[PDB]
Design a protein around this ligand. Structure first.
Ligand SMILES: O=C1C[C@@H](c2ccc(C[C@H](NC(=O)C(F)(F)F)c3nc4cc(C(F)(F)F)ccc4[nH]3)cc2)S(=O)(=O)N1
Ligand SMILES: [Mg+2]
Length: 296
């Protein structure tokens, strides 16, 4: 991976490598997503979930939500990748979180980027102004927030108003990841990923973590590809055996377009190679990522 990385850098073939993945990527139908009645549930006409892996809402009216279950069998971890919710799909979004029993939500975009709306304000910004999604019978309250320089971690309480059951949902918000861009450095990305891991949100005891950006494929795909590769390195107890391009193709069987630019692919290599140090036993690299990230 490292020598393949340098080989690609030397010859400047990141674009060629990335285009090959695009050409080889799976193509499955997205009939449900394309139904006329679901047009207002899709943020982008060219980003849809495959029918075979789409998440179904547990409601009779219309069970559609632009979200995909990325089930990585060998690594033993599943993620739900979804688009940033629209003003009319925020209730659907939390219904999915509730039904799929997710413990964490990872957001990699901002509500507004470069002057345009990319995601609805689907969570409460203030403790005293909780949100009620009447269409879904759910209530969401901000309990507390831990604000860092480039990301914020929020504690939310989600309540099923019908049963009165409540659950704590952790919200991991990366606020400086530019659209179609990459994190400031491998260290800041890994420090964030390990914060999510240490929280317990990715544990198989919970439902799949929900990951999203604006379309739920570029930044979200980068986040999941790095996490799955690192997980696979330890799962196999053989880090050098992990082929990142093959892992990306496997993930693309579940949702189209994961990793949206050749540079995000390049960053993925960088993050995984650096992350492999922790897998290889370096018990000091984690604290180094934290320092290099300047989260204070
Ligand atoms: O890093 C990223 C890219 C974002 C992204 C936003 C929106 C779309 C769909 C959008 N659709 C639409 O805008 C529309 F529905 F088709 F009009 C979209 N933006 C595009 C830009 C180019 C580019 F190469 F020229 F940059 C090519 C195709 C594009 N599709 C895809 C990815 S993300 O939220 O997935 N993270
Ligand atoms: Mg206040």
């Amino acid at each position: 991976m490292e020598k393949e990385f340098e080989q690609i850098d030397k010859s400047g073939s990141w674009a060629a490598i990335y285009q090959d993945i695009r050409h080889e990527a799976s193509d499955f139908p997205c009939r449900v997503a394309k139904l006329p009645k679901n047009k207002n549930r899709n943020r982008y006409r060219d980003v849809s979930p495959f029918d075979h892996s789409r998440i179904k809402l547990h409601q009779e009216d219309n069970d559609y939500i632009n979200a995909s279950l990325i089930k990585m069998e060998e690594a033993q971890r599943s993620y739900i990748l979804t688009q940033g919710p629209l003003p009319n799909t925020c209730g659907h979004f939390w219904e999915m979180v509730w039904e799929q029993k997710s413990r964490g939500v990872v957001m990699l975009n901002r509500v507004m980027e470069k002057g345009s709306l990319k995601c609805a304000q689907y969570w409460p910004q203030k403790e005293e102004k909780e949100m009620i999604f009447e269409d879904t019978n759910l209530k969401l309250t901000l309990i507390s927030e831990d604000i860092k320089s480039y990301y914020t971690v929020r504690q939310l309480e989600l309540e099923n108003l019908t049963t009165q059951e409540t659950r704590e949902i952790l919200h991991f918000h990366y606020t400086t990841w530019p659209d179609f861009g990459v994190p400031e450095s491998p260290a800041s990305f890994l420090n964030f990923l390990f914060k999510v891991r240490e929280s317990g949100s990715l544990s198989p005891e919970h439902g799949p973590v929900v990951v999203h950006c604006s379309a739920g494929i570029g930044r979200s795909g980068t986040f999941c590809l790095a996490d799955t590769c690192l997980l696979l390195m330890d799962k196999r107890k053989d880090p050098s055996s992990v082929d990142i391009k093959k892992v990306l193709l496997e993930m693309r069987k579940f949702r189209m377009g994961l990793i949206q630019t050749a540079d995000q692919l390049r960053f993925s290599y960088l993050a995984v190679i650096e992350g492999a140090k922790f897998i290889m036993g370096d018990s000091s690299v984690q604290d180094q990522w934290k320092e290099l990230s300047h989260e204070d």
